Amino acid sequence: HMPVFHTRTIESILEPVAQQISHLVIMHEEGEVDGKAIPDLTAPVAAVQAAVSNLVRVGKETVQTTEDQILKRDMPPAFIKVENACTKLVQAAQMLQSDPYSVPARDYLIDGSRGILSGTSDLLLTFDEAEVRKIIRVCKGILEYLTVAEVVETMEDLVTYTKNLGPGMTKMAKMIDERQQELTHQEHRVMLVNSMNTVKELLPVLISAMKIFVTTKNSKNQGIEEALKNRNFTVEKMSAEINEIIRVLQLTSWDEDAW
Amino acid sequence: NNIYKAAKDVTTSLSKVLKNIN
C-alpha cells in the first residue's frame, strides 16, 4: 500500500486503481466482503486482456528500440507478471460466470488485479529510470566539458567553447526543467530547480571570466592570476551544482550495472 | 509516450471492473 510514485504521469495512471484496490484490501482482513453476485465479466475483463496485450507489445518494441541494457533486462520480467496476473483475472471471471457467489473466484480477482497493477508499475518505473539515465549522461557530459574550460587561451578557442557548451547547457536545462515538473517529492524538486538555476546564472559568468582571461593573456597589462581564480571557481561551483543534480537523479534511477 | 498510453488503458479498463464490487 502507498506506492512510491515518482512522477505525476505514472501516479495519475496507477493512483486510481491503486485506491480502488487499497479500499478493497481493507475489505478483507476486517470485513471479508462476500455476498453480492457478480455479473459475467466476460466483457469487461476482455477490455483489460486486450489492453494488457497491447501494453506487452509496446514493451517488447520498447526493448528493441531502447539502447539501455538495464531496460532490456528489467522489462521482460515485467511482461510476464502483467500477463500472468491477467490469466488469473480472466479465469476468476469465468468462475464467477458459473457461480457469482464463488469466494475462491473472488480471490483470483484481487490477486490478479494487484499483480497487473504491480506488473505495470514495474514497467513504468523501468522505463522512467532509463529516461533519467539519459539525463545523467547529458549532465556527466557537461561536467566533462567544463573541464576543457581551463585549456582555452585564445578568443578563437573561446568562441569554439561557447558554441559547444551553450547548446549542451540548453539540452540539460530543458531536460532538468522537464524533469522537476514531473517530480512528486517537492523536496527533490527544490534542489533541482535551485541547482539548475544557479548553473544557468553561472554560464554567462564563466564565459566572461574566460574572456577576461584570454584578454589579459595577449596583453602587456599584467594581472592574470585573479582571472584564473574566478574562472576556476566558477567551474568548481558550477560543477558542484551539476554533481548535486546527478546525485538527486540517481537516488531512484540507479542499478547495479549502471553502464 | 506510447508506453504511458497503453498503461492507462490497462488501468482504465481495470477500473470499470473493480468498480462493480462497491
mmCIF file of C-alpha atoms in Angstrom:
data_model
loop_
_atom_site.group_PDB
_atom_site.id
_atom_site.type_symbol
_atom_site.label_atom_id
_atom_site.label_comp_id
_atom_site.label_asym_id
_atom_site.label_seq_id
_atom_site.Cartn_x
_atom_site.Cartn_y
_atom_site.Cartn_z
ATOM 1 C CA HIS A 1 0.000 0.000 0.000
ATOM 2 C CA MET A 2 1.057 3.607 -0.556
ATOM 3 C CA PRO A 3 3.404 3.093 -3.513
ATOM 4 C CA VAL A 4 6.450 5.039 -4.462
ATOM 5 C CA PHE A 5 5.107 7.245 -7.248
ATOM 6 C CA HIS A 6 7.990 9.275 -8.577
ATOM 7 C CA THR A 7 6.447 11.306 -11.375
ATOM 8 C CA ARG A 8 2.934 12.720 -11.786
ATOM 9 C CA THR A 9 2.446 10.799 -15.038
ATOM 10 C CA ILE A 10 2.774 7.314 -13.550
ATOM 11 C CA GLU A 11 0.786 8.272 -10.444
ATOM 12 C CA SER A 12 -2.101 9.669 -12.489
ATOM 13 C CA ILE A 13 -2.148 6.202 -14.082
ATOM 14 C CA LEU A 14 -1.722 3.951 -11.056
ATOM 15 C CA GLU A 15 -3.305 6.131 -8.353
ATOM 16 C CA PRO A 16 -6.911 5.464 -9.441
ATOM 17 C CA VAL A 17 -6.876 1.646 -9.444
ATOM 18 C CA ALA A 18 -4.271 1.688 -6.669
ATOM 19 C CA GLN A 19 -7.012 3.161 -4.493
ATOM 20 C CA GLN A 20 -9.891 1.028 -5.763
ATOM 21 C CA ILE A 21 -7.679 -1.838 -4.586
ATOM 22 C CA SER A 22 -6.481 -0.359 -1.303
ATOM 23 C CA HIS A 23 -10.078 0.458 -0.360
ATOM 24 C CA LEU A 24 -10.757 -3.220 -1.070
ATOM 25 C CA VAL A 25 -7.826 -4.784 0.783
ATOM 26 C CA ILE A 26 -9.265 -3.157 3.913
ATOM 27 C CA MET A 27 -12.436 -5.032 2.991
ATOM 28 C CA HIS A 28 -10.947 -8.448 3.737
ATOM 29 C CA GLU A 29 -8.862 -8.856 6.884
ATOM 30 C CA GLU A 30 -11.538 -6.756 8.580
ATOM 31 C CA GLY A 31 -14.796 -7.372 6.716
ATOM 32 C CA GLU A 32 -14.248 -10.168 4.210
ATOM 33 C CA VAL A 33 -16.546 -8.657 1.572
ATOM 34 C CA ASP A 34 -18.585 -11.578 0.245
ATOM 35 C CA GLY A 35 -22.205 -11.720 -0.883
ATOM 36 C CA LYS A 36 -23.306 -9.606 -3.841
ATOM 37 C CA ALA A 37 -23.421 -11.706 -7.004
ATOM 38 C CA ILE A 38 -21.034 -10.551 -9.735
ATOM 39 C CA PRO A 39 -22.366 -10.351 -13.299
ATOM 40 C CA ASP A 40 -20.333 -12.029 -16.039
ATOM 41 C CA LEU A 41 -17.190 -10.002 -16.692
ATOM 42 C CA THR A 42 -16.563 -11.859 -19.950
ATOM 43 C CA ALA A 43 -16.701 -8.387 -21.478
ATOM 44 C CA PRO A 44 -15.053 -6.000 -19.003
ATOM 45 C CA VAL A 45 -12.220 -8.474 -18.398
ATOM 46 C CA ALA A 46 -11.779 -8.698 -22.163
ATOM 47 C CA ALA A 47 -11.209 -4.945 -22.092
ATOM 48 C CA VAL A 48 -8.208 -5.431 -19.789
ATOM 49 C CA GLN A 49 -6.907 -8.560 -21.516
ATOM 50 C CA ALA A 50 -6.745 -6.613 -24.780
ATOM 51 C CA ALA A 51 -5.060 -3.573 -23.228
ATOM 52 C CA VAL A 52 -2.594 -5.871 -21.440
ATOM 53 C CA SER A 53 -1.601 -7.494 -24.724
ATOM 54 C CA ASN A 54 -1.170 -4.042 -26.267
ATOM 55 C CA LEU A 55 0.957 -2.968 -23.315
ATOM 56 C CA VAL A 56 3.135 -6.061 -23.561
ATOM 57 C CA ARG A 57 3.511 -5.454 -27.295
ATOM 58 C CA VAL A 58 4.708 -1.866 -26.885
ATOM 59 C CA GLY A 59 7.131 -3.018 -24.192
ATOM 60 C CA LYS A 60 8.578 -5.664 -26.476
ATOM 61 C CA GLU A 61 9.026 -2.918 -29.054
ATOM 62 C CA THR A 62 10.476 -0.530 -26.474
ATOM 63 C CA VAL A 63 13.117 -3.177 -25.791
ATOM 64 C CA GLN A 64 14.141 -3.481 -29.433
ATOM 65 C CA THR A 65 14.362 0.295 -29.852
ATOM 66 C CA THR A 66 15.987 1.102 -26.500
ATOM 67 C CA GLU A 67 19.752 1.045 -26.032
ATOM 68 C CA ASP A 68 19.759 0.879 -22.234
ATOM 69 C CA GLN A 69 20.933 -2.561 -21.103
ATOM 70 C CA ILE A 70 19.087 -2.404 -17.778
ATOM 71 C CA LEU A 71 15.802 -1.920 -19.621
ATOM 72 C CA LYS A 72 16.422 -4.913 -21.877
ATOM 73 C CA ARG A 73 16.874 -6.967 -18.715
ATOM 74 C CA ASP A 74 14.288 -5.429 -16.380
ATOM 75 C CA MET A 75 11.254 -5.087 -18.641
ATOM 76 C CA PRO A 76 10.976 -8.674 -19.921
ATOM 77 C CA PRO A 77 10.282 -9.969 -16.394
ATOM 78 C CA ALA A 78 7.541 -7.363 -16.025
ATOM 79 C CA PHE A 79 5.773 -8.546 -19.183
ATOM 80 C CA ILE A 80 5.189 -11.968 -17.639
ATOM 81 C CA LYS A 81 3.984 -10.520 -14.330
ATOM 82 C CA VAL A 82 1.253 -8.493 -16.067
ATOM 83 C CA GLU A 83 0.451 -11.381 -18.397
ATOM 84 C CA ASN A 84 0.354 -13.945 -15.591
ATOM 85 C CA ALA A 85 -1.821 -11.902 -13.235
ATOM 86 C CA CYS A 86 -4.086 -11.325 -16.230
ATOM 87 C CA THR A 87 -4.678 -15.014 -16.941
ATOM 88 C CA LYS A 88 -5.741 -15.124 -13.299
ATOM 89 C CA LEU A 89 -8.233 -12.272 -13.739
ATOM 90 C CA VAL A 90 -9.634 -13.832 -16.906
ATOM 91 C CA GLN A 91 -10.124 -17.143 -15.088
ATOM 92 C CA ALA A 92 -11.666 -15.565 -11.993
ATOM 93 C CA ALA A 93 -14.214 -14.188 -14.459
ATOM 94 C CA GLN A 94 -15.454 -17.473 -15.918
ATOM 95 C CA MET A 95 -15.556 -18.767 -12.353
ATOM 96 C CA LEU A 96 -17.991 -16.059 -11.305
ATOM 97 C CA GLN A 97 -19.746 -16.616 -14.633
ATOM 98 C CA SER A 98 -20.821 -20.087 -13.493
ATOM 99 C CA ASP A 99 -21.070 -19.004 -9.846
ATOM 100 C CA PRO A 100 -21.372 -15.353 -8.799
ATOM 101 C CA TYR A 101 -21.051 -16.276 -5.126
ATOM 102 C CA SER A 102 -17.807 -18.206 -5.554
ATOM 103 C CA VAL A 103 -15.457 -16.997 -2.817
ATOM 104 C CA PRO A 104 -12.352 -18.562 -4.366
ATOM 105 C CA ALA A 105 -13.157 -16.768 -7.628
ATOM 106 C CA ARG A 106 -13.222 -13.558 -5.588
ATOM 107 C CA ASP A 107 -9.636 -14.190 -4.501
ATOM 108 C CA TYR A 108 -8.463 -14.670 -8.082
ATOM 109 C CA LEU A 109 -9.828 -11.204 -8.874
ATOM 110 C CA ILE A 110 -7.876 -9.470 -6.110
ATOM 111 C CA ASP A 111 -4.531 -11.254 -6.504
ATOM 112 C CA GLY A 112 -4.789 -10.812 -10.281
ATOM 113 C CA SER A 113 -5.703 -7.127 -10.068
ATOM 114 C CA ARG A 114 -2.824 -6.350 -7.712
ATOM 115 C CA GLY A 115 -0.500 -8.381 -9.927
ATOM 116 C CA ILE A 116 -1.485 -6.440 -13.040
ATOM 117 C CA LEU A 117 -1.136 -3.199 -11.097
ATOM 118 C CA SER A 118 2.274 -4.185 -9.723
ATOM 119 C CA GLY A 119 3.465 -5.562 -13.051
ATOM 120 C CA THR A 120 2.511 -2.265 -14.671
ATOM 121 C CA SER A 121 4.219 -0.017 -12.135
ATOM 122 C CA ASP A 122 7.409 -2.026 -12.594
ATOM 123 C CA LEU A 123 7.200 -1.446 -16.343
ATOM 124 C CA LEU A 124 6.734 2.306 -15.948
ATOM 125 C CA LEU A 125 9.464 2.529 -13.310
ATOM 126 C CA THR A 126 11.985 0.709 -15.507
ATOM 127 C CA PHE A 127 11.168 2.995 -18.410
ATOM 128 C CA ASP A 128 11.421 6.113 -16.268
ATOM 129 C CA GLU A 129 14.796 5.011 -14.934
ATOM 130 C CA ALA A 130 16.152 4.654 -18.461
ATOM 131 C CA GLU A 131 14.858 8.102 -19.326
ATOM 132 C CA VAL A 132 16.528 9.569 -16.247
ATOM 133 C CA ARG A 133 19.694 7.660 -17.117
ATOM 134 C CA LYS A 134 19.732 9.613 -20.380
ATOM 135 C CA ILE A 135 19.785 12.896 -18.424
ATOM 136 C CA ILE A 136 22.611 11.819 -16.118
ATOM 137 C CA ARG A 137 24.743 11.138 -19.173
ATOM 138 C CA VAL A 138 23.977 14.589 -20.561
ATOM 139 C CA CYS A 139 24.838 16.015 -17.139
ATOM 140 C CA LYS A 140 28.036 13.983 -16.894
ATOM 141 C CA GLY A 141 28.876 15.321 -20.363
ATOM 142 C CA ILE A 142 28.518 18.992 -19.416
ATOM 143 C CA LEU A 143 30.631 18.242 -16.357
ATOM 144 C CA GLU A 144 33.372 16.887 -18.601
ATOM 145 C CA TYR A 145 33.339 19.845 -20.988
ATOM 146 C CA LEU A 146 33.582 22.318 -18.105
ATOM 147 C CA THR A 147 36.997 20.699 -17.673
ATOM 148 C CA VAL A 148 38.140 21.913 -21.082
ATOM 149 C CA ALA A 149 37.447 25.484 -19.993
ATOM 150 C CA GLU A 150 40.933 25.744 -18.495
ATOM 151 C CA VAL A 151 42.534 24.951 -21.842
ATOM 152 C CA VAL A 152 41.022 27.919 -23.660
ATOM 153 C CA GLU A 153 43.630 30.662 -24.088
ATOM 154 C CA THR A 154 42.589 32.351 -27.343
ATOM 155 C CA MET A 155 39.404 34.105 -28.436
ATOM 156 C CA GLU A 156 39.276 31.594 -31.283
ATOM 157 C CA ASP A 157 39.035 28.792 -28.730
ATOM 158 C CA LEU A 158 36.648 30.761 -26.513
ATOM 159 C CA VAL A 159 34.290 31.081 -29.487
ATOM 160 C CA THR A 160 34.507 27.351 -30.130
ATOM 161 C CA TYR A 161 33.971 26.508 -26.462
ATOM 162 C CA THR A 162 30.884 28.720 -26.243
ATOM 163 C CA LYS A 163 29.321 27.254 -29.388
ATOM 164 C CA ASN A 164 29.681 23.736 -27.979
ATOM 165 C CA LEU A 165 28.797 24.327 -24.328
ATOM 166 C CA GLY A 166 25.821 26.620 -24.966
ATOM 167 C CA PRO A 167 23.763 24.069 -26.875
ATOM 168 C CA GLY A 168 24.676 21.459 -24.272
ATOM 169 C CA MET A 169 23.831 23.729 -21.367
ATOM 170 C CA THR A 170 20.435 24.173 -23.053
ATOM 171 C CA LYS A 171 19.664 20.489 -23.532
ATOM 172 C CA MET A 172 20.431 19.792 -19.859
ATOM 173 C CA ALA A 173 18.395 22.803 -18.740
ATOM 174 C CA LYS A 174 15.499 21.565 -20.891
ATOM 175 C CA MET A 175 15.776 18.039 -19.500
ATOM 176 C CA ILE A 176 16.070 19.281 -15.925
ATOM 177 C CA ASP A 177 13.119 21.638 -16.232
ATOM 178 C CA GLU A 178 11.002 18.946 -17.856
ATOM 179 C CA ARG A 179 12.066 16.678 -15.001
ATOM 180 C CA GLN A 180 11.329 18.731 -11.887
ATOM 181 C CA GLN A 181 7.923 19.453 -13.426
ATOM 182 C CA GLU A 182 7.060 15.743 -13.113
ATOM 183 C CA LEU A 183 8.643 15.027 -9.740
ATOM 184 C CA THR A 184 6.176 14.413 -6.907
ATOM 185 C CA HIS A 185 8.555 14.846 -3.971
ATOM 186 C CA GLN A 186 8.657 18.631 -3.559
ATOM 187 C CA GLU A 187 11.890 18.031 -1.664
ATOM 188 C CA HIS A 188 13.851 16.811 -4.686
ATOM 189 C CA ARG A 189 12.248 19.421 -6.966
ATOM 190 C CA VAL A 190 13.657 22.330 -4.947
ATOM 191 C CA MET A 191 17.219 21.016 -5.163
ATOM 192 C CA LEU A 192 16.890 20.509 -8.921
ATOM 193 C CA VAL A 193 15.438 23.966 -9.604
ATOM 194 C CA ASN A 194 17.925 25.842 -7.446
ATOM 195 C CA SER A 195 20.847 23.862 -8.831
ATOM 196 C CA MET A 196 19.859 24.293 -12.481
ATOM 197 C CA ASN A 197 19.160 27.987 -11.999
ATOM 198 C CA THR A 198 22.485 28.554 -10.252
ATOM 199 C CA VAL A 199 24.156 26.792 -13.149
ATOM 200 C CA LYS A 200 22.294 28.878 -15.732
ATOM 201 C CA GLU A 201 23.335 32.024 -13.839
ATOM 202 C CA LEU A 202 26.996 30.972 -13.815
ATOM 203 C CA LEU A 203 27.385 30.121 -17.510
ATOM 204 C CA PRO A 204 27.495 33.736 -18.713
ATOM 205 C CA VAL A 205 29.720 34.364 -15.708
ATOM 206 C CA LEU A 206 32.036 31.561 -16.794
ATOM 207 C CA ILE A 207 32.343 32.883 -20.346
ATOM 208 C CA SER A 208 33.094 36.412 -19.175
ATOM 209 C CA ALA A 209 35.800 35.087 -16.857
ATOM 210 C CA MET A 210 37.324 33.132 -19.727
ATOM 211 C CA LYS A 211 37.067 36.176 -21.999
ATOM 212 C CA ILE A 212 38.744 38.424 -19.450
ATOM 213 C CA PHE A 213 41.425 35.729 -19.244
ATOM 214 C CA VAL A 214 42.175 35.446 -22.969
ATOM 215 C CA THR A 215 42.229 39.249 -22.983
ATOM 216 C CA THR A 216 44.821 39.508 -20.217
ATOM 217 C CA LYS A 217 46.815 36.768 -21.937
ATOM 218 C CA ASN A 218 47.879 38.577 -25.110
ATOM 219 C CA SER A 219 48.294 41.962 -23.429
ATOM 220 C CA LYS A 220 51.179 43.774 -21.737
ATOM 221 C CA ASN A 221 48.726 44.722 -18.995
ATOM 222 C CA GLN A 222 49.630 42.171 -16.325
ATOM 223 C CA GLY A 223 47.153 40.776 -13.803
ATOM 224 C CA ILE A 224 46.137 37.281 -14.893
ATOM 225 C CA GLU A 225 46.279 35.312 -11.650
ATOM 226 C CA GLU A 226 42.988 36.579 -10.219
ATOM 227 C CA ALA A 227 41.479 35.887 -13.642
ATOM 228 C CA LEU A 228 42.260 32.167 -13.477
ATOM 229 C CA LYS A 229 40.859 32.048 -9.957
ATOM 230 C CA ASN A 230 37.476 33.483 -10.914
ATOM 231 C CA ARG A 231 37.320 31.190 -13.936
ATOM 232 C CA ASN A 232 38.377 28.174 -11.874
ATOM 233 C CA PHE A 233 35.986 28.987 -9.020
ATOM 234 C CA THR A 234 33.080 29.255 -11.444
ATOM 235 C CA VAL A 235 33.812 25.835 -12.909
ATOM 236 C CA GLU A 236 34.148 24.427 -9.388
ATOM 237 C CA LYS A 237 30.867 25.888 -8.148
ATOM 238 C CA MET A 238 29.133 25.051 -11.423
ATOM 239 C CA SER A 239 30.497 21.507 -11.229
ATOM 240 C CA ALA A 240 29.308 21.218 -7.641
ATOM 241 C CA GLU A 241 25.736 22.089 -8.628
ATOM 242 C CA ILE A 242 25.791 19.611 -11.523
ATOM 243 C CA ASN A 243 27.102 16.845 -9.272
ATOM 244 C CA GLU A 244 24.272 17.745 -6.918
ATOM 245 C CA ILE A 245 21.729 17.303 -9.730
ATOM 246 C CA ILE A 246 23.215 13.981 -10.849
ATOM 247 C CA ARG A 247 23.043 12.640 -7.308
ATOM 248 C CA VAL A 248 19.427 13.692 -6.723
ATOM 249 C CA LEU A 249 18.623 11.977 -10.007
ATOM 250 C CA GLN A 250 20.411 8.722 -9.128
ATOM 251 C CA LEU A 251 18.523 8.489 -5.845
ATOM 252 C CA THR A 252 15.945 6.260 -7.543
ATOM 253 C CA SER A 253 17.206 5.691 -11.085
ATOM 254 C CA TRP A 254 20.266 3.641 -10.104
ATOM 255 C CA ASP A 255 21.064 -0.016 -10.815
ATOM 256 C CA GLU A 256 23.970 -2.357 -10.044
ATOM 257 C CA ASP A 257 25.015 -2.336 -13.708
ATOM 258 C CA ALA A 258 24.873 1.382 -14.499
ATOM 259 C CA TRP A 259 26.907 1.375 -17.715
ATOM 260 C CA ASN B 1 4.789 8.440 -24.695
ATOM 261 C CA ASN B 2 3.123 5.375 -26.222
ATOM 262 C CA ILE B 3 4.065 3.401 -23.107
ATOM 263 C CA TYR B 4 2.018 5.666 -20.843
ATOM 264 C CA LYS B 5 -0.923 5.433 -23.235
ATOM 265 C CA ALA B 6 -1.206 1.644 -23.044
ATOM 266 C CA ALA B 7 -0.678 1.743 -19.270
ATOM 267 C CA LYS B 8 -3.710 3.992 -18.787
ATOM 268 C CA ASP B 9 -5.791 1.690 -20.974
ATOM 269 C CA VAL B 10 -4.936 -1.158 -18.614
ATOM 270 C CA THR B 11 -5.831 0.836 -15.500
ATOM 271 C CA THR B 12 -8.932 2.327 -17.161
ATOM 272 C CA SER B 13 -10.474 -0.980 -18.225
ATOM 273 C CA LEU B 14 -9.497 -2.481 -14.861
ATOM 274 C CA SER B 15 -11.145 0.402 -13.003
ATOM 275 C CA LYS B 16 -14.539 -0.241 -14.592
ATOM 276 C CA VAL B 17 -14.075 -3.851 -13.464
ATOM 277 C CA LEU B 18 -13.385 -3.318 -9.767
ATOM 278 C CA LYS B 19 -15.976 -0.540 -9.606
ATOM 279 C CA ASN B 20 -18.585 -3.282 -9.938
ATOM 280 C CA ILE B 21 -17.713 -4.544 -6.455
ATOM 281 C CA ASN B 22 -18.536 -1.499 -4.340
#
